[PDB]
Amino acid sequence: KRRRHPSG
Amino acid sequence: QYQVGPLLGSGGFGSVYSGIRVSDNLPVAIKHVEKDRISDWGEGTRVPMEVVLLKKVSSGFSGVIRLLDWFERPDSFVLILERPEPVQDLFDFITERGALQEELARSFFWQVLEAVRHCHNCGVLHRDIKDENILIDLNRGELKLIDFGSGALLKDTVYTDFDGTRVYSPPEWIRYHRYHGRSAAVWSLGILLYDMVCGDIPFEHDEEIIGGQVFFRQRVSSECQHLIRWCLALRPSDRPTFEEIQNHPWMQDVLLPQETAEIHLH
Ligand SMILES: CC(=O)c1cccc(-c2cnc3ccc(NCC4CC4)nn23)c1
Residues that bind ATP, according to the entry (chain B)? Predict the structure, then answer.
């Protein structure tokens, strides 16, 4: 459910 | 001159290593980006925009991680940055602690606002404010902004380019590919504040971003909900200015960073 989101 | 330690992480920003300056054992971070991977350059010669922006903001003390030096290589640039010790990024702090107590969120949010004001006063827009780009100095209770690789010089005209994080990007970017710097920054701050008091970001999909329905998944005070909802106004001109944020009633009586470390981090 919770995650990092890379740029771009 | 620098003794290279382990790799801390890598991604769209390049590869970041722990390091120590030999000359005096100062902890540093050593950041490598390949030239082919860089798109936004600036004016020495053509440097990556991160170097231009970091130099604009690295003078004096602030809540921004400071550029100590940089080097060009044939295929890459290397940046030497401050490294607090010990140090956890805000994304991981939140994952491990869940939703933050409001007193703590207030202290963190205040510090981020001061850092962003600093950047804007220096003519710099970060454009990727999010928990992954904020370090906590766990002993001092101080927050530091990192990663200016998607930033730009601050201007009063429209931006039609964006390589920051989409889930922190405002509805006007999603619908129109157009935004103004400050109002887009304030939106990202709303996302960040929600993330802190709820334990994750409010929106995952384009449709949620443009719908602008804020649902609170945790118990959050009425005053805090009001501030978040104001930062997340669909119309850019309906969002608060930095002054209005800092004057908001939820933002009064902020703890000092040392108090914050003592009560919440130590
Ligand atoms: C994690 C850490 O100690 C540190 C310290 C100073 C600067 C940076 C830094 C500077 N620019 C970036 C861009 C991305 C980034 N990622 C967070 C950790 C995985 C490298 N760190 N980072 C990280």
Answer: 8-16, 31, 82, 89
Helix, strand or coil, per DSSP, at residue B120: helix
What DSSP character marks residue B254? Answer: P
Domain interval for residue B167: 86-266
Q: Which residues of B touch A (CB under 8 A)?
A: 11-13, 91, 95, 128, 130, 132, 149-150, 163-168, 199-200
Nearest to A5 among B13, B165, B199 (CB): B165
The total of structural domains in chain B comes to 2
B95, B163, B200 member nearest A7 (Cβ): B163
In the annotation, is B128 catalytic? yes
Whether residue A7 and residue B167 make contact (CB cut-off 8 A), yes or no, is no
Lookup: tokens for B88: 């956890």
CATH code for position B64: 3.30.200.20
Alpha-carbon dihedral of residues B126, B132, B136, B142, nearest 10 degrees? 20
Resolution as reported, in Å: 1.9
Residue of B36, B69, B75, B128 with catalytic role: B128
